Ligand binder design. Structure first.
Ligand SMILES: [Ca+2]
Ligand SMILES: [Ca+2]
Ligand SMILES: [Ca+2]
Ligand SMILES: [Ca+2]
Ligand SMILES: [Mn+2]
Ligand SMILES: [Mn+2]
Ligand SMILES: [Mn+2]
Ligand SMILES: [Mn+2]
Lengths: 12, 237, 237, 237, 237, 12, 12, 12
């Protein structure tokens, strides 16, 4: 429902 | 004031108070200025797990934050909790938002404390585990904007009907029963706590964080301890 | 109103209110007049154990009282606790003396409640275990002549300085945090309690007994609930 | 001889050997012809949970099968396991297919046995909990087409490469270490087992079922115990 | 050879192999020559308790030995068990006598292992607890002179009818089921073990000690590993 | 794939 | 002190 | 049944 708003999301 | 020991999952870096220039997890001993930090690849919108452990033999408080198929951030500090905390305390979760917001949703929380007295197997223990939260959760003390029952989760901070987070919000949850965290004639005292959280930020700028804390039995949310103070301290000292 | 569901270790036969002509263990549902009882071979001065168990599948409350390498008494009764108690209760131990006396010494106590909601693994549970009683047990609610600390034991009724029992004494101990004993959407709900006791009588016939009970959160010691009412009931109805 | 005491999740009605005209859960004592059965609302493709509980005070073996926010089936039966099994047993899961097929996927499994001897606190206990199944699970004894690793699940019967069930398949999994299920001088003896399963059938009517069972240590898969015998019995007597 | 990690309660100082000039407890990593020791006021004839704990966040193995109303000896060493042990091991107790003897009686032993996989709450766990030992204890592997059933205790070494210890004796006990001590995709792996012992020496000169160990699944008593080798190593290297 | 394909159940 | 002082029991 | 055979027993 949400995508990497800011903090580094490793992967997807 | 209150004696506070906490492991914080800081989502917003406030370098003005000693925060690393990036998301991190840290150990606080009576000060929002962590005694030890560790970079953390906060994964917005994903469920993560947090593990905090301690024992009086090593006298080392440690924690690990992780997301499935992702890496793990680890942090550890050496501290004899007998000199920092009273033998009777309370445990719980705290979290906040300030100018920027995020959802600080708790999906599950379990804890276990054990005391092995110097009289062999004089073992006393306490254990609780929450996977569901009812609207009326009588064994929890809700302070601030914290609420329960929502999809069976705990919302430590304000969140509207549309499901979006709010700014300038502070909320905590403590277990109803006091906890005997240490005793003199104790051979080995240990405790370990776990919890799954879901920090979601639509505005793409998360803040301010979630924390697991241990405090005196009568601990309450400090004035203005909103935002970067994670509802734990009254000043950034 | 005070709702009670107790498992009693009755040591004196008050046939005036329905008691069997012998020491017995029984199951009480909102009444001192046991719904089911079993002959019990009490042993003055011997340390004994008590196990109470219940699960929602059977809706059968069973208890076993025994002494080391001796006979053990059992008493079981079919009951749907959902239709008897409020989903949020408080568990504890009660005891008393009257014309006759006895020591009601608890040496250890442990409780375990588990709730498995109708969802994948939504199991909530609580577990405490006491094997040593501190002088200041902040996680216990002591009512009446109840006191902790003597040799690390919970002395329920009044025990004189020199160590001899006391007449007309009532005591109780309830675990501080409320217990979610049942829930509407629970696939399986269960608990089990264990406690070791030591009853020592100086006089001819000892009285009046100990009892494990569950009750409404705000429960308290009824008036004149001393002696044969086991500090649990106001009258003998 | 192979002694069995099983709690079965029968999904196909073999009225030729006593089965009810519907999917059901039942309790089997040394025989596939259930001693007690209960109608069960199986749900093709839905993850379901199963709880089996037993205590020596009641000598009542109860089981509850349920699906999320749906009906739950219960079946209880009075039995003295002391007079049925050897004090040292081995617990495990069994399953099969025949003319019809289905997937017998275990997603998690946990067991807890406790023995309280007739002495002060001489409580022996064993507890294991599986929530993830390794590819090489050295603490499990896999018999037949049983296999671990697929998505971290225990696939009991043969599941094709593409993922579709297989006919004429039998599988079993027993925990490596023997279990002391009962003892002559036991004041209280009890166990409780939990497991989440996923049954998915491609064809019209699914068969044949899953079952939680206890047996003699050296137990093994009888011949022709495929299909309606649930890999637990040699004949239908 | 076998990979061995152990916490030894060395009752006899063999300075020829690096032993401190007095009773001590220590941590051995594949060598009888401890990597870390700590003086221990061994109290002949008295029951003592031993606590060993570890977790992969601190990666520190710690232990505390104590006797009631007496002091506690503590020792800790930093070691990543992932590089020292295989992920599947076995746990148990070992002990010996040589020229001098002592009784190495085990009164109770419990252990608990937990794995939290990097997929959140992918928690797997194992727990066993012994307070009584039967003559025929099928869940234990007895090697050497170890025996059970005697007063309900475990005698790791030879002891005659008169109850006096024997010289040149080696005996161990391992849990039947293999233990998954660590996994790669693991966020936090931890285990803690406890046991009460009674080292008695009539000849006033105790030797050689008791140890808690972790080894490869197929570990067996080494040649001549009697006396000062604590039945753990084949040479004093 | 196979979700709840089975006898008389409330809603879908 | 008070050990097993109570009704009909095998041995003492 | 046994008294400080050798190892220092703190107390009795
Ligand atoms: Ca911050
Ligand atoms: Ca009475
Ligand atoms: Ca069938
Ligand atoms: Ca030595
Ligand atoms: Mn910070
Ligand atoms: Mn009565
Ligand atoms: Mn059937
Ligand atoms: Mn040494």
């Amino acid at each position: 429902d949400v995508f990497y708003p800011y903090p580094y999301a490793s992967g997807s | 004031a209150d004696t506070i020991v906490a492991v914080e999952l800081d989502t917003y870096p406030n370098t003005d108070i000693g925060d690393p220039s990036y998301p991190h997890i840290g150990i606080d001993i009576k000060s929002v200025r962590s005694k030890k930090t560790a970079k953390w690849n906060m994964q917005n919108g994903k469920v993560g797990t947090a593990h905090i452990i301690y024992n009086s033999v090593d006298k080392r408080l440690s924690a690990v934050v992780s997301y499935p198929n992702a890496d793990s951030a680890t942090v550890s500090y050496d501290v004899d909790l007998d000199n920092v905390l009273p033998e009777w305390v309370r445990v719980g979760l705290s979290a906040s938002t300030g100018l920027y917001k995020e959802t600080n949703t708790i999906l599950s929380w379990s804890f276990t404390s054990k005391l092995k007295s110097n009289s062999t197997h004089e073992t006393n223990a306490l254990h609780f585990m929450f996977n569901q939260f009812s609207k009326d959760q009588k064994d929890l003390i809700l302070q601030g904007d914290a609420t329960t029952g929502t999809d069976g989760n705990l919302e430590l901070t304000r969140v509207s009907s549309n499901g979006s987070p709010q700014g300038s919000s502070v909320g905590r949850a403590l277990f109803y029963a006091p906890v005997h965290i240490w005793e003199s004639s104790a051979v080995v005292a240990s405790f370990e706590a776990t919890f799954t959280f879901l920090i979601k930020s639509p505005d793409s700028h998360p803040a301010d964080g979630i924390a697991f804390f241990i405090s005196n039995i009568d601990s309450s949310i400090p004035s203005g301890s909103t935002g970067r103070l994670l509802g734990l301290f009254p000043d950034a000292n």
